Every structure is written in structure tokens, then in C-alpha cells.
Design a protein around this ligand. Sequence first.
Ligand code: CLA
Ligand code: CLA
Ligand code: CLA
Ligand SMILES: CC1=C(C/C=C(\C)CCC[C@H](C)CCC[C@H](C)CCCC(C)C)C(=O)c2ccccc2C1=O
Ligand code: SF4
Ligand code: SF4
Lengths: 144, 74, 71, 80, 41, 741, 164, 32
Amino acid sequence: AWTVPTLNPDTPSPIFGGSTGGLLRKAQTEEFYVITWEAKKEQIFEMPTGGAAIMRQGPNLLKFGKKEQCLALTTQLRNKFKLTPCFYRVFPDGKVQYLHPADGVYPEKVNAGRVGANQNMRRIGQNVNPIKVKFSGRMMSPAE
Amino acid sequence: GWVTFYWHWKHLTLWQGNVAQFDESSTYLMGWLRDYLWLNSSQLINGYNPFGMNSLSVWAWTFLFGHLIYATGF
Amino acid sequence: KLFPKFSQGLAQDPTTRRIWYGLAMAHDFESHDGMTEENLYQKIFASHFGQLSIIFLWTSGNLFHVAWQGN
Amino acid sequence: AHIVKIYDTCIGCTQCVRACPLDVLEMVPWDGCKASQMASAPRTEDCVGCKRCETACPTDFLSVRVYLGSESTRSMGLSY
Amino acid sequence: MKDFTTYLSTAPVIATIWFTFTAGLLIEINRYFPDPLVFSF
Amino acid sequence: KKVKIAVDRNPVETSFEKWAKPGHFSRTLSKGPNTTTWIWNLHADAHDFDSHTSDLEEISRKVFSAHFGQLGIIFIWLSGMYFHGARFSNYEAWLSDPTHIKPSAQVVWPIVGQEILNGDVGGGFQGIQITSGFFQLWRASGITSELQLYTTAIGGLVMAAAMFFAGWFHYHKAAPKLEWFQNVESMLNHHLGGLLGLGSLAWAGHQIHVSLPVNKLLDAGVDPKEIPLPHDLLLNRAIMADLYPSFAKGIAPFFTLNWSEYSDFLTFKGGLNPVTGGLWLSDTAHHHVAIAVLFLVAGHMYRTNWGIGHSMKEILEAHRGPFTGEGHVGLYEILTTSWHAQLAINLALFGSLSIIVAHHMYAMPPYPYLATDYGTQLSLFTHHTWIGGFCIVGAGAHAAIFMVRDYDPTNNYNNLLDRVIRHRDAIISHLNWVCIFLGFHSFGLYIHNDTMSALGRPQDMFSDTAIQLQPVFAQWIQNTHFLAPQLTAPNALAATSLTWGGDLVAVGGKVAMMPISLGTSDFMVHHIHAFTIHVTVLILLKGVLFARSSRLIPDKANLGFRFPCDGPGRGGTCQVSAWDHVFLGLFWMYNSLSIVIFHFSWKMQSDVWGTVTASGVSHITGGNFAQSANTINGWLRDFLWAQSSQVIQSYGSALSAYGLIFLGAHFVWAFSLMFLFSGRGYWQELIESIVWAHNKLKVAPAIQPRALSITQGRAVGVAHYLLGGIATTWSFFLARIISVG
Amino acid sequence: DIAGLTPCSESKAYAKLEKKELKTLEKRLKQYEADSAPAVALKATMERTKARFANYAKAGLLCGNDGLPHLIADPGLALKYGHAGEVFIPTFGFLYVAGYIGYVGRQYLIAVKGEAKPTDKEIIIDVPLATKLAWQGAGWPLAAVQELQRGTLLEKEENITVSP
Amino acid sequence: SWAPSVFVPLTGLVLPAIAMATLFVYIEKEAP
Ligand code: CLA
Ligand code: CLA
Ligand code: CLA
Ligand SMILES: CC1=C(C/C=C(\C)CCC[C@H](C)CCC[C@H](C)CCCC(C)C)C(=O)c2ccccc2C1=O
Ligand code: SF4
Ligand code: SF4
């Protein structure tokens, strides 16, 4: 059922008079991050950039400069409001990247099919000494 | 700083002659404060004044300059 | 992008601590990129020649300023 | 980017993922604990290194472990 | 007043009674035996 | 009745059972210690009532009875000052010669040689010379006997017991409900009317009937045992008509509105009493009469139970304009459902009151023989500026506690507070600019004068004999306030103070007050003050506005008001909380107010204070503020080095305790730098290495030794820093001014 | 005269400093009536001062060139020359009370470890157990050497370490 | 005798102005 939703900018933004905490030139040159969620009713939420906005019934679209701003907005929408948001990554050449729930399931629940990167099948007290990893090209931790 | 305070003040009282002025005052920290720090920093801080200046003014400036860097460290 | 020639990870730093750490872990030769123990010893040997030349230049400057502007 | 490794002392109580402010961490199936699950760090490009994950790990001598590495514009947490 | 005596046995209350005891012992000593620099007989 | 008494009978049972259980208030601390952080969290979370429970009624009951506890402690304190003024003082002697007898009200016990502190204060008396100004209060009240001091000390003990019983009653026996506290209109009507209005009417009554005749007989010159007692001044109208000949007309001119006939004892003189150097008590009498009428008018403003009056929600929701969105809507509901939002405003305006008190009590000295007691003047200015600055930093703290805890974005959409949060970047950026501008163009003037005086170029300095920076605006205000009795206040017999211009009042051979000239160094130090006040505003307001989020940490409000950090990540996030901003604002309040009290202590000793001979008055430091405060070396030499020459050689005298504390507070201050510079992961591992030694000798404690918390070590460092700096300046000021003043 | 010194009953700077302090007290006393309350306290300060000088000269303290008493902190120069009450007698008069407190607190910890939860009796001190250990700790060096002869004073390598 | 009037402005105003320029241009160079 779930396979990697796309985005249009046609979905409205929540009603917000504009703050000085918005986007900067990093949004126009490097990247900026947009968040979507479907709201059930019109209610007031706190912006992660300072200020209160009111979300409207149906789809919303709000844009930020950090992944921490978008995930903080998801954290207060999923906890205070029980909504299901998702945020993406937009580059200035129009390339959009799906970022949050990669597999659809939120990352604190097992989806049975995601792959375990950056795992050490050994105990953290069983790391080697830094003399054993010396002159490994770059400076390097014994956890490798 | 303790070893050079002690070196400097025992040698200042030696060079002036009055080693008793050290021996009576170095036993208590007020004697370190007023008979060494307050007393010997008179001609230092009088390097420049509204009356004029002398050859110690470059040490009067640096003594404040060192007081300014120190606090900036904080 | 270029200035820590020794640290390719500092060279990819878009912030302003690229400069501050290019100045500060420049003589930590063991943490340089591509460093071997032989190039380590060679850079330390050249560094000791640099320190000796600075000490002798400093003493010659003391001597010249005493000989020229001193009594 | 920072180096976020986890270790097999994980009890699978998924507290590092809830503590993560950047969705670096996620829970993967595993068979070394009762919860039948272990964390993972697939998204260490987005890590800032704030170590909220290893304020939340209950295992003595923490199972999640963040190693502060190189800093990109995402590792420095910049809106600019 | 068993709870009042457990309150009297807490750490700051014992501290402020015992420090007044060991203060007002040494203070009465230095009243009745003025200026002890050296162990006399 | 909407406004009515509403309490709850017996809410909390009076028992010592919860005194046996430390940490009963907290859900986390009630399990007991396992760790020494428990006993610091016990004392830190002790009075944070908003974090104990969520019921606002219970929070309001706790903060209403804690105020009775504070009031009982203040009555114990005041009653002790009256008792120490009765039984251990020279006040009886001081009333006969209040120019050559030093006020003393503390005597020490002769045990370890500390009886050298019982100095020769005069009047056949030995004790510590006090500087809190109680003897001038007691002359201004008409006390004249230590019996009256002893009886008002007994009354203070009775009133302290009344306050302690009141807090016990209104918490344990009959505690008010929540909607009792939310009647702010009735609280303002009763506090403007009954506290402020009737209190100054009652003090007007004491000033008319007691203190005016007693101080008139003192100023004419009468022994205090020859003066009639004030109950013989109430009962005998003939004595009051001898002293003020309009008491013979009774209270008939008050009700016939012939109030000009009361001009014998309600005046508008202004200036100082030349007999005693204080304000005219007839002038202060008419002052408190007018203040009483004004606040009794002001306390009939707000609507409580009859249809007349204003309601503050309708006042706030009407004042809205085009620039500010919804205006003051929602501010009534956050100043009625949040105690921290009240404590922010109240600490701000109350700490501003302390500084306005400090500047209004040197220039208009309100007490007899206060102005020539230079030590009392210096200590009162310094004390009330420090209490004011601490209260302003507490305002900045509790505003941010409101922002973290009690702020609701639902109740605040497009009002003032939401629109301030939405341009906090503009606010802090422009304040950053004006702080950098004030820093360069204030401190660089001092660096310029240092450099020019050091480079042999005194003509290129900023001084009066050089490039001049004259304070034209303050000098113009001094001219208008000196010429105010001419045409803008035509019923003033003199100017409202002597600082604006004119002659000097000289009492006992010492200058009570003289005019204050404002020159280039006065310009430079007022812009030093403007700089440091704007930086303290920058830090405290940056902590308030960025209390909930920033571009660095978007979920700062979930972390709390008082949290250390959010780890080493995103560059490092040390000291990002609002608590850490008021931590850093405490240092700048110290920095600002130290220069304020230094500027006072050197402007007064240079240009005001000193003996007079009517032969060209010679001041204490000879008149070197305008001539030598151009430079940092001038503040070093002629103020710190030159005036520390009485605290450093105070040994073997009564001032020698000031010689000790000057060392000891140099200790504590530097001791704070162990806490401010270091960090917890050092000390926890050092505690591990000595916990090993206590394990080896079987003396490991069961409560496990931990290093102090991050925001505890910052609190210890800032507390010891403030204590060691302020007590250093305390000992320096008092040992200077008791000796040479 | 041990190390260039002199007895305080022999030196004249000591007597000159006594006369200096009595001179300051005398010119301070000259302001008051002879029977008033400040004059009684000033004469009592003089009496304590003169008793202090007499009892410092009586005990054989060594003055220097400054006229101030000194403390010879070496046994064999204090025992041989009669200065053991300077340091050598209070260096055991202290250590009895130091090891006393260190034994009473030790035994209060060890006698409260084996309970239900010990920490509650460390913020709320068991006063009858505390006063029992306060009185019966009088012979602490005896019990300390009898505990050292067992090995029950120390603990073995059951202690907690990191990574040797 | 003209050396302190010439070498001191060069060493403090001219050669650091080269060092404020040439050592700054080297910082932000794009790595090939
Ligand atoms: C005219 C009536 C009146 C007066 C004089 C006061 C006076 C005061 N109120 Mg207050 N208050 C009033 C009505 C009044 N209130 C009403 C109607 C309400 C409900 C809406 C409140 C609700 C309220 C709260 C919630 C709080 C106060 C507080 C205070 C104190 C402020 C501290 C101060 O300035 O100390 C000045 C000190 C004095 C004036 C000393 C004299 C003490 C007198 C005798 C007691 C005050 C008069 C009292 C109200 C009369 C009642 C007598 C009683 C037997 C019923 C002060 C004592 C605060 C406080 O500290 O509480 C303890 C506080 O937290 N008030
Ligand atoms: C009307 C005054 C007032 C009131 C009622 C409060 C009330 C409160 N404040 Mg607040 N505050 C105030 C003024 C006030 N403050 C001022 C003036 C400042 C600036 C310094 C602050 C700064 C401040 C901060 C920064 C914080 C609070 C916090 C709190 C809450 C808990 C306080 C507590 O439990 O401490 C219990 C009592 C203590 C811990 C004792 C403190 C000991 C002091 C610091 C040492 C100095 C004592 C003495 C003067 C020095 C000499 C002592 C001698 C022995 C040497 C409580 C709501 C805390 C809070 O809300 O947490 C979320 C918090 O974090 N306040
Ligand atoms: C003497 C020590 C000292 C000095 C100079 C500073 C300097 C400054 N602090 Mg600071 N601070 C200090 C101690 C000091 N701090 C301490 C001890 C703390 C501990 C709590 C803090 C905490 C602190 C905070 C929390 C804040 C500051 C802020 C500021 C800035 C405001 C002043 C300004 O911009 O004016 C301009 C600069 C000066 C007056 C500095 C001297 C410059 C002179 C006058 C002339 C310039 C030199 C000249 C061009 C020659 C150059 C030579 C060439 C070779 C380079 C400035 C950078 C605030 C800030 O940055 O916002 C504005 C701020 O928010 N400080
Ligand atoms: C010294 C220091 C410590 C160590 C301080 C320790 C933890 C506390 C100091 C000892 C306290 C005062 C407890 C000792 C008193 C006990 C109550 C026992 C009393 C026994 C009798 C006196 C009754 C820190 O934990 C720390 C943390 C963060 C930044 C800086 C520092 C820091 O500088
Ligand atoms: S640092 Fe720790 S917390 Fe921050 S993201 Fe990476 S893992 Fe989650
Ligand atoms: S680390 Fe702690 S939290 Fe993260 S998974 Fe392993 S156990 Fe659960």
C-alpha cells in the first residue's frame, strides 16, 4: 500500500503572520525542508521558529531550514495532536527527497525489513586500543 | 605566581635593607596584600597621571593591558 | 576548502572553525590524513631544524639590536 | 559526519529512537534480546552529535555511542 | 511527638545542634582559659 | 457576589509527620537518597511550587502562606533592629549630640580579642558603628527614648507571631480558594486604597501629631527628656498650638476647606532644613497627605461588586491598534493564571523602585542628620542599588519561567506576546548592535584617554581641559530644576534638592548637600552605565525571548527552564537554557552596579562630601573626579588604590573586621572561579578516586558522593562570585567612609 | 636560643611590644570615666593582655628579632630543650580527637550498612546509636590497632576499579 | 639612521598587509 509519497506546493500553509525565524539563504542555495500533515480540525500549534500558527482542515505544507525543526514539529504534532506528519528534503534544483518514515512506519517501531546499519556485533568494552588503529590513513576511533 | 611573589618580595625587602619588614609582614596574608602588592605598585600606577608621565608609563599601560586580557579570558 | 591541506575532513567544513582548527591541529602530525610513521619522523626532523633556526635568528636579532641601538 | 555505533548490549527498549531529535536511529529485527529488536544508525549524515540517544540508553556502559567526527552543515545544526 | 523527634534527628538539625554544642564548648573554654597558644600545665 | 470571600475549611492537617520525610513535596524526591544530588535537589526544588503540583489553587495557597512566613521574618528582623537599638546602643547619647557621636547598635562579646571591634563611637559607649540609618529614622519618628524602642520591639515580636499564625491559619485551617486569588480588581482596590493610601494617611497622622512637634523641639534645641511625650501632644491641643499656631483652629479648616491656614505645618518649602540637613518634616507631612489622597482616589478605580468601576479585561482588550495585531487580548488571562508572569513584572518594577529610592535619598535626604553621616548615605545607596539589580535579574528569570512553563500558544495568537516572539531576531539583533556601539563609544573613550595619557599627549584626551564631551542635556535639566521655584513651581520656597544648583547646606561642619557639576567624566560614566544596562537587558531579554526555541534548538521548551545543555552536538550547546542566560545576566548586573556604586562613591567624595570651614570647602578626595576619572588608570590609582588605603591598614582598630572580610571576600570570589571555569566530569572522576579510598578503609557512605550538577556548579560559581565581589566592595566602602567620612 | 632565637622573658622587643599594646589601650582608656562600663572592659582587656604576656614568657616560648613567640616543630629539639607543648604535645592531642571522629563515623557507617535501607539513617541520624558510638569510641586507638591486626580495617580487592 | 622610519612602517603596515591579503586568499581556495 505505502510507497514513497510525493509533494506538491499546492497544499496550503497554516495561517501564520510570518516571523523573523524563517528561512535564510541556505534555503535558496543549499537546501530547505518542507513538512506535510493532514489535520482533522482547525487548531493552534506552536511554531518551532517562534510564534503560534493555526493549522487548517486538510493538508498543510510548512517549510524549515533544519531537520531538527521539522522533527520537532512532528514531535509536537504526534504527541499533543495525534496527527501523522511527514517531512521531505528539497534542493534548489527541484529535487525532492523523502526523509521521515522511509518505510512508512515511524522509526521507534519495527517494520520487519529495514536493514541494520552501523551495528557492532560485540560489546563496547571490547573495543581495541587506539594504538591498534594508529596510522589508518585518517584519524580514526577504535570503534571504526 | 606564589614562588615569584615570594621571590620578589623577599628580594625587595633585601635590596631595600629591611628584612624585618618582610619577616613581620609575610606571616599573614594582609601583609602580602598591603606591604607588597599595594605598596610596591605606587610608582607603577603613577607611570601616567593627569600631571604628566615618565618612563614607567609603558609599564603602567601594560599593567592595565594585562588586567584587560585576563578579564577577557573570563 | 583548501587550507587544511593535512585534514580532508576539516577541508569539507563550511563553517568558520575550519580556519581555527587548521591553525590548531596543524602540528598534530599523527592525526594528519595519509600520515605514515616515516613521514611523521621526517616532518618532526624538519620541524626541529625550523625551531633551531628560529632560536639562532632570535639570538642574532638580540645581538644586532644591542650592537646597533644599544650602549 | 559523526560516528554513531550501537552495540549488542542493546535490550531493544527503543528509547534512543524516541530520544533522537533528528531521526538518525531506527529499530531493526534481531535475536539477541527478549524484545527481538535492536537499534540501527542508517542516517548518521543527519546526526548533530547531541547525545540525547545515550542519555536515554538504560544499559550500563551505554549501548548507543556517538563519536564526534567531522562537521558538515548538517552536523553543525545550521539554518544558514 | 515521635515525628518531631525524628525531625530533630535529621541532618541539618543535628548539624546545627552539634555545631552549637562544639562551638559553645570551645567558647566557654576560651572564656575560662584565655589565649591558649601553647600547652601549659 | 462575584467578589466574595471563599475559603476551604481544614485543607491540610497540621502534623510533624511530613517534617520527618524530606522530599514529601516532590514525586521524585519522596523515595529518599541514593546519591548526594538528592539533598541538593531537596533544597533547590523546595519552593518551586509550580513543579510540585499542577493545581493552581494549591500553588496559590502555598505562595500566600509563604508570604506570611516572609512577613514574620521581616517583623522578627525589624523588631530585632528596634531591640538592638534599645538595649545595645548610644541612641540616648546620640540624640544630645548627633554630630560628634557615631551611631552604634551592635556590641560584641569580649572573648577572642574581638572586643577591639567595640570601638570608641562616642557618648560613653563602645560598639560597632552601624550604617543602616536606623537612628535617623528614629529621630525622624520622634522616639527620644529607648523605652519606645523596646516597646515597638515587643510589638514587632507580637506582629511576627501574628504573621506566623496567619500563614498557619490560611494554609492549614482556613485556606482561600482559587477564585479568591483571581479577584485582582479587589486586590488592587484594597492595596491602592488600604495598604498604600491608608498607610500613608496613617503615617501622615503620625507625622502631624508626633514627629513634627518633637523634631521642632529638637531643632529649636531642647533636651529629649525635656520634650513633652507624644501622648501629651495628642491630648493637649495647647502645646500643639504653641508649636504650630493653627492647631488652635482645630479640624475646622479641613472641613471648611480653609486649608491655607494649615500652612504652618503642611508646607511646600523644598530644599533642606539648615538646622539638620534633612528634608523639612512639614514638607514630608504634606507629601504623605497628598500621597494618601491620591492613592485613596486610585483605589476606587476597579469594579468589584457594584456596577461602578473599571474591569481590567475590558481595559486591555480595548487598547489595540493597527500595528500590534490583536493588542492586549489574552494578557488578563495570563496575569491571572500564572504567578511567574506576575513575579516578573513585580520584581522588575520593585527593583526599579529600589534604584529610584537610592537616587532619591542622597539628593533629597529625608532624615535629620542623615546627609552628614556619610557612611549611612554611601551604604544606603549601595544597598538599595544592589537589591534593585537583583530584583531586575529575577524579573528576567521569572519572565522566562513563564515562557517555558506557563506560556500557551493557544491563548496567545497575534497578541503582543506572539508578535514579540515573531521578531525576537530583530529585537536581539538591534540590541546587539546598540550594545556593541555603546561598548566602543563608551569604553574606547577610556582606552583612548589611557593611550593619550600614556603617550605623553594629554591635550588629545577626553577631559574638560581637552576634547570636551559636555552633558548638555543633564545640565539643561539642572538649570530648569534650579529655576523651577521661579515660574514653573511658584509655591516652592527652594528647589526640590540641592543637586540642581544653589548653595550648600552645612551641618556640624560637614556638607549635607551641595550642587553637583556634570562634566566630561560624568558623560563618560553615564554612557558606561547605559552600555552595561543595555548589555544586561540583552542577556536577560535574549533568555526570555529564546526561552522556548531558537534556530539552534527548536524544542528548548521541552528541555525545561533549567537544563544544562543539549550535548556537545551541533557545534556545542553549552549554556543554552534561559536559566543560563540569567546566570550570565547576574555577572553583568554585578558589572553594571559595581560601576554605579563606584561612580557614586567617587563623585560624592570628590564633589559633595567633606568638611566645610566657610573658607573654600575642602572635599574628601580633594575634587579629582572630573580631573582624574578620564582613564582606567585614574579609576585604578585615585579610587581603588587610594581609597583602599583605609581598609588595608585597619588592623589593630575597630575597622579591622572590615580588614578581614576584604581579604575573605577576595577569597570567596576567587573560590568561585574553581566552579565557573571547571566542569563536572573532572570532579566526578576525582570523587571516584577518593570513593576508592573510602572503600579501601570501609568508610564509603551509603548516600553516594556525586559531583555537583552542571547548573548547580554554575549556581555555586555565580553565588560565590557575587558574594565575594559585593562583600569586598562592602568592606572597602565601609572601612573607607567610617574612617575618612 | 635554639636557632638564633631568644627566650621571650629575655628579649626586649617582646617587652616593647607589650608596652606598645598597653600604650594603645591606655590612650584608648583616657577618654572615659574611671568607673563606666567601657573603662571596665578596657581594663579587663589590659588584664587579659598582661596575663597573656606573663604566661607566654612563663612557658619558655622562643622569641625572634621581631619579639614574637615561635614554635619549634621538631621532636628532639622540643623534647631536648623543653618545647614539647608547642607542637609535640598537641600533635597527639589533635590526633586522638581526629581518629576519634574518624572511628565514630566509621563505626556509625558500618553499623548502619546492614539494614533495610541505610541512606535514610544517614540523612536522619539514629541518635541512640550515634550517642552509643560516641561514648564507646573513647578507646579508639586500642580498637584501631586490634582491627588492623585482623585485616578487618582494610578491604581486599573486592573494591571497585575501572580498567587496570 | 633612516632605518627605523622605514622598516617599522613596512613591518607593521605593509608586509602584514601582504600577510593580511595573501594568507587570507589561501584560506577560501576551491580545492581541485
Ligand atoms: C485594605 C485591605 C488590604 C490590605 C491592607 C492588604 C495588605 C497586604 N496584602 Mg492583601 N488582599 C486584600 C486586601 C488587603 N491586603 C484582598 C481584598 C485580597 C483578595 C483579593 C488580598 C490578597 C492578597 C494576596 C494574595 C497577597 C496579599 C498580600 C498583602 C501584603 C503585601 C505585603 C506588604 O506590603 O506588606 C505590608 C505590611 C503591612 C501593611 C503590615 C501590617 C499587617 C496588617 C495588619 C495585615 C494586612 C491587613 C489585612 C488585610 C487586614 C485583615 C485582618 C485579618 C484579621 C482579617 C499586605 C500586608 C501578599 C502577602 O504578603 O500576603 C501575606 C499576598 O501574597 N494580599
Ligand atoms: C520575590 C522574590 C523571588 C521569589 C519569590 C522567587 C521564587 C522562585 N524562584 Mg527566583 N529569583 C529571584 C527572586 C525570587 N524568586 C531573584 C531576585 C533572582 C535573581 C538572582 C531569581 C532567580 C531565579 C532562578 C535563576 C531560579 C529561580 C527559581 C525560583 C523558584 C524556586 C526557588 C527555590 O526553591 O529556591 C530555594 C532556595 C535556595 C536554593 C537557596 C538559594 C541560596 C542563595 C542563592 C545563596 C545566597 C544566600 C545568601 C543571601 C548569601 C549569604 C549566605 C551566608 C550563609 C554566606 C521560585 C518560584 C528557580 C526555578 O523556578 O526553577 C525552575 C530557578 O531556577 N529564581
Ligand atoms: C574586560 C573583559 C571583557 C571584555 C572586554 C568583554 C567584551 C565584550 N563582551 Mg563580555 N564578558 C566578560 C568580560 C569581558 N567582555 C566576562 C568576564 C563575562 C562572564 C559572564 C562576559 C560575558 C558576556 C556576555 C554574556 C555578553 C558579553 C558581551 C560582550 C561584548 C559587548 C561589548 C561590546 O561589544 O563593545 C565593544 C567592545 C569592547 C568594549 C571591547 C574592547 C574594545 C576596545 C574598546 C577597542 C577595540 C580595540 C582596537 C580596535 C584595537 C585593535 C587592535 C588590533 C591589533 C586588533 C564585548 C565583545 C555581549 C555581546 O557580545 O553582545 C554585545 C554579551 O551578550 N560578554
Ligand atoms: C569543587 C567542585 C565540585 C566538587 C564540590 C563537591 C561536590 C561539594 C563540596 C563538599 C560539599 C560542601 C559537601 C560537604 C559537607 C557535607 C554536607 C558533609 C558535612 C559533614 C559535617 C561538616 C557536618 C563540583 O562538583 C563541581 C561541579 C561542577 C563545576 C565545578 C565543580 C567544582 O569546582
Ligand atoms: S546524536 Fe545521538 S541523539 Fe542526536 S541524533 Fe545522533 S543519535 Fe540521535
Ligand atoms: S540503546 Fe538503550 S535504548 Fe537504544 S535501543 Fe539499545 S537499549 Fe533501547
